[PDB]
Design a protein around this ligand. Structure first.
Ligand SMILES: */C=C/C(=O)Nc1cc(-c2ccccc2)ccn1
Length: 306
């Protein structure tokens, strides 16, 4: 046996929400007004392109299946879908964009407290995904979103695989892949587990401590297998103490069960977030600070449906 997934999929009318402007090329920034609820919820609307490509609709509703089946503060909520000519995913708007573009744009403004809180919240998000027997398979800084600089959510469940009642690792077959974030076992034999997610968590933390540097930048993805089998890893980022970087190294052990458990990463970064300056050394660290009637505006996170 396995647990029934009793998640609600909400179908929304096109009339319940107003497309304000474009965010990506087709993701819109908009507002959702639940019929006779007197609440305005900032939303990001993912609308299909051609939306006649059957295989593309499979993907998007598979994203929807996974996103509806998650309810955690460090993982982004699917608010519902609109079944129009072109399927629309309606999600909580994460106004400040991908954490990757965030650390790139604000490296001069990002203190140790924020980096180390980001490491914890992402690890809470991921440890929630392990609790729900779910393997992300595409965790990177690009796929973490910034509701505020104090609060990030894991995203892109387009590659997430909902493990079996005894499916030890998720077998897969071909496509475009995240080589430079991937556990060695995934590159070589397409093995993906909560542990191979932890590996990508390590590349995710590396990206954050380097303020968004490209992992193995200028190294073809063809060699990455041989480089990792040869024992090579990503280098210690400047701002990183041996401590922090040693947690990243542990995430990249070849023995999967020798890597840290997400619940462990929470504890370890939590400890370090209690004394951030002792664990991350950044020029001017203490100096650092970060941020049409909207009367009935309410964040997705304060909008609860039973
Ligand atoms: C998990 C919620 C979510 O995706 N919110 C969101 C997403 C974007 C976005 C989507 C696709 C590409 C770029 C940016 C922007 C704001 N919130």
């Amino acid at each position: 046996g396995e647990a029934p997934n009793q998640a609600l999929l909400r179908i929304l009318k096109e009339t319940e929400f107003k497309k304000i402007k474009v965010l990506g090329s087709t993701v819109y920034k908009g507002l959702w007004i639940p019929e006779g609820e007197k609440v305005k919820i900032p939303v990001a609307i993912k609308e299909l392109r051609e939306a006649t490509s059957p295989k593309a609709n499979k993907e998007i509703l598979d994203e929807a299946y996974v996103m509806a089946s998650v309810d955690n503060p460090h993982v982004c909520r699917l608010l519902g879908i609109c079944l129009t000519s072109t399927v629309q995913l309606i999600m909580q708007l994460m106004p400040f964009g991908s954490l990757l573009d965030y650390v790139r744009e604000h490296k001069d403004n990002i203190g140790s407290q924020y980096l180390l809180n980001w490491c914890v919240q992402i690890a809470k998000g991921m440890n929630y995904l392990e609790d729900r027997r779910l393997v992300h398979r595409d965790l990177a800084a690009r796929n973490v979103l910034v509701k505020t600089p104090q609060h990030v959510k894991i995203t892109d469940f387009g590659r997430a695989k909902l493990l079996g009642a005894a499916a030890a690792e998720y077998h897969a077959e071909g496509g475009k892949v995240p080589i430079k974030w991937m556990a060695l076992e995934s590159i070589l034999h397409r093995i993906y587990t909560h542990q191979s997610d932890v590996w990508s968590y390590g590349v995710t933390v590396w990206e954050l401590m380097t303020f968004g540097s490209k992992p193995y930048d200028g190294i073809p993805a063809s060699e990455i297998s041989s480089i990792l089998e040869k024992g090579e890893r990503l280098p210690q980022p400047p701002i990183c103490t041996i401590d922090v970087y040693m947690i990243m190294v542990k995430c990249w052990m070849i023995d999967a069960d020798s890597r840290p458990k997400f619940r462990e990463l929470i504890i370890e970064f939590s400890k370090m977030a209690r004394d951030p300056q002792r664990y991350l050394v950044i020029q001017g660290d203490e100096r650092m600070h970060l941020p049409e009637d909207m009367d009935d505006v309410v964040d997705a996170d304060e909008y609860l449906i039973p």
